[PDB]
Design a protein around this ligand. Structure first.
Ligand SMILES: NC(=O)c1ccc[n+]([C@@H]2O[C@H](COP(=O)([O-])OP(=O)(O)OC[C@H]3O[C@@H](n4cnc5c(N)ncnc54)[C@H](OP(=O)(O)O)[C@@H]3O)[C@@H](O)[C@H]2O)c1
Ligand SMILES: O=C1C[C@@H](c2ccc(O)cc2)Oc2cc(O)ccc21
Length: 314
């Protein structure tokens, strides 16, 4: 069901991923988020970047209004985008996300990325020649503002995302730190299991939350289309046939059994309903080591632009 975070709040171990590319109409996010909740999902992952907070927020309020759930049954996550790292922009950004979602609080607010961008109204500020424009921000000052947000009850819990071990220790060793990150949300799948990072997070009681756990949406803007398709993996497919389940269910169950909290995006009613079946079966110890063996040091997200960022975690 849930795992106890280091601030005493509780996070459900299966989460619905709400990101869709801009080519998908905004109305779908409202439709599918209601369906996710209808199928059993209680953890819901959004962000300012996704341009979908209004719709995801309305789906939550929809399912509270019709009596299916109460607000305290729902774990709602947003993320501070990289153009708002400067400490004075953090709380208005969160307050802006609350207003879009028409909620009083988020269950979880994250620094979306350590790679600061130029402040402004543009998600991806690019210079006179189309190159992204970086900013330089001491992320400890950003974290201090995150902590103020938790102390104001605007975020029940705070954490980070796309941080490496070095960027985490910077927070953990900050003088006067008040709140440790409750999680580190990072790319994690059988082709990149992050076992070393996972062990470091366990050592600090930091939850690792896996994104692109099914191999990502393979958007060619960000992912090489000729990379291996995770769900087409023969070991995963052979384990699906063995357990009368499906490659995606295998890949999801793998993370739960390693103590990872796992996200799964789908905008397809039947696949949404299928993913909640992850709680219905068990992987053996022999299957787990076989999935461990698929690790290929492959992060699907690749960008020559962000690779030169003095904050690039890889
Ligand atoms: N913090 C970060 O930097 C970050 C980065 C990436 C993602 N995330 C979060 O993590 C979420 C999930 O990651 P993701 O968007 O990369 O996708 P994902 O969870 O890895 O899913 C990849 C694809 O799998 C398909 N799928 C879903 N269930 C399936 C099933 N049972 N059988 C077969 N295929 C299935 C989906 O297609 P259909 O929609 O057609 O079903 C989806 O496009 C995101 O939505 C977002 O909330 C965070
Ligand atoms: O699929 C993407 C694209 C990518 C991105 C978009 C715009 C940009 O300027 C930089 C990165 O970040 C993401 C973050 C997320 O949480 C989920 C999905 C993605």
């Amino acid at each position: 069901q849930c795992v106890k975070l280091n601030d005493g709040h509780f996070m459900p171990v299966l989460g619905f991923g709400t990101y869709a590319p801009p080519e998908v109409p905004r109305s779908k996010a409202l439709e599918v988020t209601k369906l996710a909740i209808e199928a059993g999902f209680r953890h819901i992952d959004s962000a300012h970047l996704y341009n979908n907070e209004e719709q995801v927020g309305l789906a939550i309020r929809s399912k509270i209004a019709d009596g299916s759930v109460k607000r305290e049954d729902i774990f709602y996550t947003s993320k501070l985008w990289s153009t708002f790292h400067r400490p004075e922009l953090v709380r208005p950004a969160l307050e802006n996300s609350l207003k879009k979602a028409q909620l009083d609080y988020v269950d979880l607010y994250l620094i979306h990325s350590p790679m600061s961008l130029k402040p402004g109204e543009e998600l991806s500020p690019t210079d006179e020649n189309g190159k992204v424009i970086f900013d330089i921000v001491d992320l400890c000052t950003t974290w201090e503002a995150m902590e103020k947000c938790k102390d104001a009850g605007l975020a029940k819990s705070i954490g980070v995302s796309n941080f490496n071990r070095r960027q985490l220790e910077m927070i953990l060793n900050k003088p006067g730190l008040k709140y440790k990150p409750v999680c580190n949300q990072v790319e994690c799948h059988p082709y990149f299991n992050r076992s070393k990072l996972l062990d470091f997070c366990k050592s600090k009681d930091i939850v690792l939350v896996a994104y692109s756990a099914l191999g990502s949406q393979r958007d060619k803007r960000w992912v090489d289309p000729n990379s291996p398709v995770l769900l087409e993996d023969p070991v995963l497919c052979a384990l699906a046939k063995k357990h009368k389940r499906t490659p995606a269910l295998i890949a999801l169950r793998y993370q739960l059994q390693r103590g990872v909290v796992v996200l799964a995006k789908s905008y397809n009613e039947q696949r949404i309903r299928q993913n909640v079946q992850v709680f219905e079966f068990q992987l053996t110890a022999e299957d787990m080591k076989a999935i461990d063996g698929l690790d290929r040091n492959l992060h699907y997200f690749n960008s020559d632009s962000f690779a030169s960022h003095p904050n690039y975690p890889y």
